[PDB]
Amino acid sequence: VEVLEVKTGVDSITEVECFLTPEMGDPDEHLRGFSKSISISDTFESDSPNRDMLPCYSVARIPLPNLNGNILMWEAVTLKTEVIGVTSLMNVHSNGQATHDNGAGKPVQGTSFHFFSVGGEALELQGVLFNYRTKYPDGTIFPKNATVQSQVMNTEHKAYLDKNKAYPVECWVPDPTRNENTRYFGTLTGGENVPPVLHITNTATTVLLDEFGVGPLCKGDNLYLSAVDVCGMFTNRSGSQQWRGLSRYFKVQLRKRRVK
Amino acid sequence: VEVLEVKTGVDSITEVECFLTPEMGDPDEHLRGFSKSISISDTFESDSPNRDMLPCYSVARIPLPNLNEDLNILMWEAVTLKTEVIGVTSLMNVHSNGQATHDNGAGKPVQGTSFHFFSVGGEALELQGVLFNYRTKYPDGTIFPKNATVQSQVMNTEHKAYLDKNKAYPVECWVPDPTRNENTRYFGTLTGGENVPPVLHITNTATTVLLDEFGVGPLCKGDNLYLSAVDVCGMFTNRSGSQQWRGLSRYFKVQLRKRRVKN
Amino acid sequence: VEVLEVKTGDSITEVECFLTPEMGDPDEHLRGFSKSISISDTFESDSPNRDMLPCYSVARIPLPNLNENILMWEAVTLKTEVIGVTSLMNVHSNGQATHDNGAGKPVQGTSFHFFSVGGEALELQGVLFNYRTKYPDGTIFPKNATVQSQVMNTEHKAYLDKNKAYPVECWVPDPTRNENTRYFGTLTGGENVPPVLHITNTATTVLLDEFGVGPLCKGDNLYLSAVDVCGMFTNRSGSQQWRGLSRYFKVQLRKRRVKN
Amino acid sequence: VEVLEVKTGDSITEVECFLTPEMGDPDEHLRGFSKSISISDTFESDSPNRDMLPCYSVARIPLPNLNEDLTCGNILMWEAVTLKTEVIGVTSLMNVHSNGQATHDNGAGKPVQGTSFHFFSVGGEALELQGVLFNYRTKYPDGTIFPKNATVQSQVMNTEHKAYLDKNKAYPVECWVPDPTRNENTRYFGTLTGGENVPPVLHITNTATTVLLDEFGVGPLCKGDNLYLSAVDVCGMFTNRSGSQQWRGLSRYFKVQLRKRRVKN
């Protein structure tokens, strides 16, 4: 692609606004936004996580207004994003485990992963396994032909984030060797007791242009939005723990760009 | 609206200065600024929090000087905010029926989950409902997401409301709706965890500019300014181990100017 | 006051001093410490002893007399820092061992670090943790307290006009006043909070407002106020005392012409 | 070398690669982990096994060959100008469901946490190392390259301990640091976060660039058309059901942009 001039005028811009729901595992009809209770296999060899226990990446493919070698493409220029429902984590009165005698429920805390991406094509994934002997369950899409090298880097594990409730968070990351046409941002905050720190504002914009002033270019007039918002773990009265996730809002401003 | 020029001169500017009190539940005549002690339900199905156990959003509707005889009109535009949590040093009272942190020690200070939030708008803050637990029974006297479903635990677009009443909208059920709020500027931080330390900064030297990327602030419909806040600072643990939310008031000073619009 | 031009040339002066902390000083050996904390069994019986209450520090500094349409001293810049930060490395003076054979628990827990520069007394607003607290003789505290005093009672207005008198826990700078003062403070709460104290002679704070005007010194007096509660010292017994440190101030002033 | 003008026009190249971590790999299933940590019975008997010691990672990357023809008083060198880098596989640390120790009764497994070292360098020659020992009486194992003729001074600064990071799986992290008195032709960056419970904080983005130019606008100059990349990404320790702890490391991605620079040699 040779990138030429931006189109100007009233009809040269469009905006996408939507929310991606989290896919934490949803172990029953009452537990949307939660995983199944976490269990611990006795050995790496016996690690066989239940589908319902594995958070997955969220993805939405958004069709844009139809535009057309010498063509126009939608270019993603800005992003506003927000985690939706941060105050829900103040419910410390619902089937929780008291922190001490007579105390309030222990709040959602521990390992979090907050991730979002905007691209002109599916997010490209690289597989990395904590334990190459993990048996990923039917219904998930996971690194195939895993070897002990999969624990650090096995270049065979390439995928596209092209399906919902399918790609487990723990075995996939954005592939830094690809994703030229995507902007991605993520933070893993580890530890058993790390407190969530969640900021909300409608005053913050991320610019998606690269160092050449070029944003993601939407192939086939499709925009790809991806997210993960594992906020931590909910501890119930028994001490068992479940991942808890929240939805993510996206607002993307796009402009027409001529390319060859 | 088409937004046109700012009016200048002595008469073109006004200021709002006020404080919003916290609405933490106020369980008796001695406990203004505190919630009821927290109780925990023994199942998701049995969650039934009492009204005095639920912190609520604070809101004030501030009438501004009348601009038009009949509403090509003038509107008050909010341009700058100075804000501060009032009484941060009260959290140094570690001698008042607190739980000793160890044998012969001082009282445990207020700590744990906090929510610090403020907004300035030309209309009521627009809320989206999100529920930790869709089967929670919210109490009479509160305004809460209705017709809740399991989808209410992640995103149910039915739960739309206006922050239009004080001591009514529970903090835990509602957030600013990011799909709306074009005419409001909002800012909030949830710091979770039972041990997190409050970090509270005070200064009279800090200003927030409320102008958007087009140089336009909140425009006050009907000449009303809307101020909203939550300042849940954490939990107070008393000698028994019982925990209560503790809140503090928030100071607002907003500078406004007259702006011509075509509406 | 119409504020007119700055004088140039005899037109500048500097104030440099240390403000000592007022932590309660419970005996002849314990300057910089409070009495050990004791806890009431009810809110209604909260009756803290004077030597258990840290107070605001204040100094009124007479400047060179002006005007034998007048000149006023304008405060323009501040250098400040906490003096004696390294004294908190004394972990051998009859403290509580962190574990068997261990060093003494260092000073830690709730801190309040606060400083102000003004051309008049710092203006205060009272806020009470517990409106039924009985404040002791020889302190100046919110009077006619009601339950509304726990969140905001506008009757509680005062001037920081006396050293060792205004308890820290029942007063804050009044944000509705203090037009002629610049103040800065941080409360860090929690029994395990680590002190984080920075020292440098390279950092300057500008005291000019949005209009280029610093505090103007009424009657040619500069007002410096401070609190530096660093945390609590834990004795071998488990008893805890507030520990405070002195604050250095260097203020540069210039002569400014004003009308009345 | 006096640095002259940048060549313009085939005047720019890119290196993209990843460096695997070298944590000790104690068996055929534990690539990316160390052996479980054992504690010596006395300070003077410290004697860590090779598979218990994380080492520095290094790769030397050949660049397009310059100066094929005889030149007179001048050569071209590849100059490293920008870096994008990140840790690969940060989400793997969300596996709290295998062989772990419950945080509390009925809880999930304790995640990887505790001491971390995150380090990367880009240079026109091998990273220069200085040795500093926690304990000068530590017996370092066969197959490692460690500070030799150690004395009690080695615990603070013994200027004899000079080395080049010129071998993978060999230089123990705990023995060596970048030599701040050398490394003129390298840019290095590292953070040690100590403590038994410290939580990993790992950021990923493809939007962040580090500029490698010094205060004169000159990046690392690649001697012999070779680029040296070095890394350590000890993320923390994994705790087994038994309580035994193993270091866990992750791979590092590098993308380096280079331009041809004329120099008077």
Next chain:
Amino acid sequence: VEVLEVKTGDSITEVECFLTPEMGDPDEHLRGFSKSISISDTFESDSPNRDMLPCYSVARIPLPNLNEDLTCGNILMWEAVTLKTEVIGVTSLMNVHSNGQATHDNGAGKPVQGTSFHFFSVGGEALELQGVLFNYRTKYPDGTIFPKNATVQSQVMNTEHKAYLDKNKAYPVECWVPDPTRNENTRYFGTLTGGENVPPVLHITNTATTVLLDEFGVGPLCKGDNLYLSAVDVCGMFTNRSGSQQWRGLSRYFKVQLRKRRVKN
């Protein structure tokens, strides 16, 4: 007294060196460590041994001699303009195998953690000190230089306690701080991080420069062509298997660029 123009051309020099820590060095094997910490039986009987007290480090570095010929109303002085600095040997704190106290049953040794003081200064004369005592009744030991004629006022501010950092291994860290009322000809920077579980956070890079010029564009001016470097790098405490705890320190690297400045008497 009057600072005039910078000399150009011969006109620039660099100082590069390390300052070793002075943590107390309680025996021939324990350079960089203090004596294990003991606690007094009463507040009034506090009496720390010399080898239990970290001290300030100082080096005076001779610069190229200036003003070899008679001058008239003016001299040249070396002016310190920039500083690169870093802690040397940060990775040594990853030794969790050397007879430390296990974090839990079968776990690795507790890393160095707890209270830290990281301090450095560059000046054209000795660092000026002010004494502040935690406890004015502490008995400071023979071989140290400590605030004398201590009173209860010494616990917050006794202006009698003025000193110069003019001797290595002598001025205990806990007794002394930079005097903010003096030090016009020094630039100093320090952070105290207090608490028994405080994790070390130590960054290393050769890409960060501190500018030493004041608001008038003048750096420290070196009296008698001597540059004073001072440091403290108490990284935390090491916990032995027994539970006993020792301060652990590390060396600090300094690189200072200086230029010749003309000054009028």
